[PDB]
Amino acid sequence: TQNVLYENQKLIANQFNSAIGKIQDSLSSTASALGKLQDVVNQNAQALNTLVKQLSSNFGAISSVLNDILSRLDKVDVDLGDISGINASVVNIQKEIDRLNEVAKNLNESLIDLQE
Amino acid sequence: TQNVLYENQKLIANQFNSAIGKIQDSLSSTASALGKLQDVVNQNAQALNTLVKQLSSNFGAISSVLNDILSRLDKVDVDLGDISGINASVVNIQKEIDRLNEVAKNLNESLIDLQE
Amino acid sequence: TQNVLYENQKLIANQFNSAIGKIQDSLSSTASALGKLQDVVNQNAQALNTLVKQLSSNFGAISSVLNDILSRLDKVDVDLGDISGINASVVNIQKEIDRLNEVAKNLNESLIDLQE
């Protein structure tokens, strides 16, 4: 029984350690994917905001030129739709990303080193 | 051997329980990050859609004013590009988020309470 | 002691195997959620880019019609804001998604089959 029991414990430690290594990689991959999603979402939010600000300035100019045209045509007050309140939010998941990376490293302390 | 074998089992249970706690936190962090990404992506999708609808109404008005101007200038049919089919999709990962939170809680049932 | 020790090992293997199954599901859920986020972010990035390209073509046409109008009004050089450099990035986390799915399947090899 003692040789089956000790070989069992070795098998358990080895399989556990093996599973922990695989989980560490999966946490690092997850952290990496979240970081890239966070960056692109925030980049595309900033693009949308920049777009909005430049558009409403383009509608301002168009409105001013149209108004000038209309008066000069009377010689022989058009308000375009305001978009400047449209706003894309940014995301912040850095604390969650840091936690996953911290656990991937911390799980090293959970490895089993059996006594021979 | 019996004292090494039992101390081994204690070490294994304790290290496993320790690893499970760390994995639970990582699942909760992942669930939290996915929820925030889902919310911002969907918010910015709605902003883009609202923007599209207001823009094409702005091009409608511009077209109508330009057309009026052109006729009055003849007295002494411009079609602007249609954007109204541009559409941002929304994302729904709530079932995946619920599963991660459910596993974080369920893994409590996987903890080892050894017999002394 | 030998019957407590062997029943302990059974309990450990069973609880570990149980925890591994739950972690596999959580990895598959995470992989699934990342894939859906990647797809919607990239879809909405393409919508934003398509929108930008069609808008600046709409401002080109408006500029050309306004310019024509202004000359005909003189008979009895307006530059609108350029947006064509606004660009939404796409995200690529497929390698991270593949790693999570690969670990979910690989962890099958980490299961414990004890010797009776």
Curated annotation (Swiss-Prot), chains A, B, C:
Region of interest: Heptad repeat 2:
77-116
Q: Where is this region: Heptad repeat 1?
A: 9-59
- Which sequence ranges form a coiled-coil region, renumbered to this chain? 38-76, 90-116
Q: How the protein is affected by changing S71A?
A: In strain: Alpha/B.1.1.7
Residues modified by glycosylation:
N87, N108
Explain the purpose of this protein: Subunit of the fusion protein that is processed upon entry into the host cell. Mediates fusion of the virion and cellular membranes by functioning as a class I viral fusion protein. Contains a viral fusion peptide that is unmasked after S2 cleavage. This cleavage can occur at the cell membrane by host TMPRSS2 or during endocytosis by host CSTL. In either case, this triggers an extensive and irreversible conformational change that leads to fusion of the viral envelope with the cellular cytoplasmic membrane, releasing viral genomic RNA into the host cell cytoplasm.
What protein name is recorded for this chain?
Spike protein S2'
* Species per Swiss-Prot/TrEMBL record: Severe acute respiratory syndrome coronavirus 2 (2019-nCoV)
As recorded in Swiss-Prot or TrEMBL, the protein's gene is named S
Residues represented out of the complete protein? 912 to 1202 of 1273
